[PDB]
Design a protein around this nucleic acid. Sequence first.
DNA 1: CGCTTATGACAGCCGCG
DNA 2: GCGGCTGTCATAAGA
Length: 896
Amino acid sequence: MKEFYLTVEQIGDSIFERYIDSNGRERTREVEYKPSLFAHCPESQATKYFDIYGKPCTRKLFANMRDASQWIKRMEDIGLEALGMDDFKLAYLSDTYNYEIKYDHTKIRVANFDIEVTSPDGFPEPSQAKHPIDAITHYDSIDDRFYVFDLLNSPYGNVEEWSIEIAAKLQEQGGDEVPSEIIDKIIYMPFDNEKELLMEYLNFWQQKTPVILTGWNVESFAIPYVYNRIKNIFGESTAKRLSPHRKTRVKVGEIITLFGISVLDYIDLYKKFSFTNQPSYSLDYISEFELNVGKLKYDGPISKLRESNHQRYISYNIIAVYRVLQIDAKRQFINLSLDMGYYAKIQIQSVFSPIKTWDAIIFNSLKEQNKVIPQGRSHPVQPYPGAFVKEPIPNRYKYVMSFDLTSLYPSIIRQVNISPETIAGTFKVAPLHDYINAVAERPSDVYSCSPNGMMYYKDRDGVVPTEITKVFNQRKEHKGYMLAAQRNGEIIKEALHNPNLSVDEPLDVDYRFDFSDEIKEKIKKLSAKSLNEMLFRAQRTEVAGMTAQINRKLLINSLYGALGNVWFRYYDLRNATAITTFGQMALQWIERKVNEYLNEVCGTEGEAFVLYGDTDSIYVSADKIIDKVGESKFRDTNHWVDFLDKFARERMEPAIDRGFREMCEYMNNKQHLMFMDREAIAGPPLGSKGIGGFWTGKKRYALNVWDMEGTRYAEPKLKIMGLETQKSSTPKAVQKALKECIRRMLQEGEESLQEYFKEFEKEFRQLNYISIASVSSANNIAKYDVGGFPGPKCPFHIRGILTYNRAIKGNIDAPQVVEGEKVYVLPLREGNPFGDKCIAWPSGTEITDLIKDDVLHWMDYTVLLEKTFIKPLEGFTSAAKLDYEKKASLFDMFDF
DNA sequence: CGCTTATGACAGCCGCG
DNA sequence: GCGGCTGTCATAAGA
């Protein structure tokens, strides 16, 4: 098979690499890699190497990486550019694997683990690791087995072996409901003492050294804990065996790095490739959201679970590891990482760095062309203008249609041809609004321009534009294979309804391309076995395409980040500013065009149809459009929705393309790529007193959407942005009551809203105290505390945390409030035994007794309702010109 | 090296018969 | 006592 690398490391003058050889077996090697860097030479010197600016360069081969680094140091002192890939690991990978690498995941050892550490005195700090490790569950992808290390005797108790029979039984039967699909994949290993467990674990680790190591929070807890525990008991020399190269290091805080291993903490792979931003990121919360089943439940505090119910303790450890494997089975984020890393030829963990990923992609691309990359330069962090957001007029908007530009920044780079080596010059910049209204002199009739004053060559392809354009082509390329493979999805599926009993074999065709009609019906006459393999193959294909297509998308959207980053090799302040300023002009330019077109077709004069714009989207009020045809002439909702849809497709879009076409010629851009697509269509139900939507201000609105990019909803979906209903700090009961308030406003009207509001006020005091409590995170708690009391400028939540501390000062059983975590908050009436206006206890749990009964007795309902429900509702209703309460004065809306 | 553009909940001034 | 400001802190998109 085709060889590929697993991990790579640089230690001194050697490159340590683990990899899969042609035979498919994992191997390791040390190589005295000789790097090459470059320097500018004279034109008279014959060479084949040129920097991206066309300047000639001489290749300097060094005897070892240390000499290369030394040379770079000398060049900086002399003041002359040192060109080439200074990260020798990338160079080595590029040189060793100069070809599209095909990898076989079944050969990559992926370890998923989790440990448990009983601790009476609070969270067991990894940097100390003062407590024994009493449980370890380590899943290995190659053996597809769950290895469980159980400590029977510890200073905290002696227990009996864990029972797999009891683990499989149901809850009602005293069991742990450990899934039957892993029950046979568990290898149990009990131990008499801790030293025997760690040493057996460490030995196990040497025999099955992980390539990719993941799990939940493993980088911040499990890995550092295991490392330090071993180091503290045995020597550091023993702890270093956790690294296949016996080499480790420490980073920010207590982040241990194990050379020869790629750590991909699943908690990070989630906060990166899932894009959903959950309120909480605990394995329990995430597991519920993705699998509709969280971690195993248990009674009492975790610090006492091992001694009170060791059976459940071990099963809990095994489930925690399985949940992560289940989520991955759904998100496939590990597979993605591998795919992206192998694509850019970087260490798998670098996938977390857009800068490193793009650096490697451009580097390998330029290498094939014999070009030499620029030297990374030092750049002062300098803030520059970003996206444009229009200030909306607070109000209700009955009918709205939004339009979004596709891949704005990446497109702008291509259109204007922005790149460091394509910079051609500058021009006198006029006020941005002069360009938006096309009253300013045309910037240049020779170069491609950006409203910030930069001019670019049109006669040459830029390094960046070209590189981004290639990923765009690979995108539609792969998204084209799984597109046709989808067509074959029915040619094979439906071929099972009325096939034949002819015993045959599965044909050899490429599902990437449409099935040839010369073999089309040839398949509609095979056995039940082959046909079930014909669709099986079509699955691998239609799925493989997804990963590639998704990876290309992630790269495309992360390019701008890198370009704005001073640590990026191709960074340039002018270029980053050219991108955002252009985007700012484009959005406002098109806003002007849409208004101009809609006024003309409506006979109106200087009317504002665009009510809001943000970055690459605009929202248009369609009331005039609807009235132009009369609202009473529509049969139902779907009727006017079909009308606006049609009007957008055959009237607005063409007018938009014409508008952007003009802007491209005005800035004399290299190529027109400003494409807008109708996004949403929103409005109230036909025949209702509802208000399709409203805006309170920037980033704050709600719309009753009926259609999104062509897909018509059976029922209108609320699209809410920025309002408290979207805030994790908003109490549960209130978050849903605020949503129902908005739904009623958009779909049913004022009266319905007032009816609900009244009922909710009446029944507020009957809601669970946990559902009506706001949530917040405890930060800098030690910055505003003065001996149990609040210091100067002490936040409200933090003030409540202290009130809790004091009230529980002297109890170790009651839940303590740690830092950086989330906590519930509740206001208290004046004259409470807590001597404060509020109290806050840890989240996810109920108020410990001894104070619970009192809290419920002193909690201020009035203030709670007013502060979390009424205040924000009034914000929505004021903007929407609605009253949530009868007999409300009209003058209250005026300033004095 | 794994940021902008924003809003809102509070705290703490200054000023005014 | 509140305005009308100036900070700190806490939170969402999208790239």
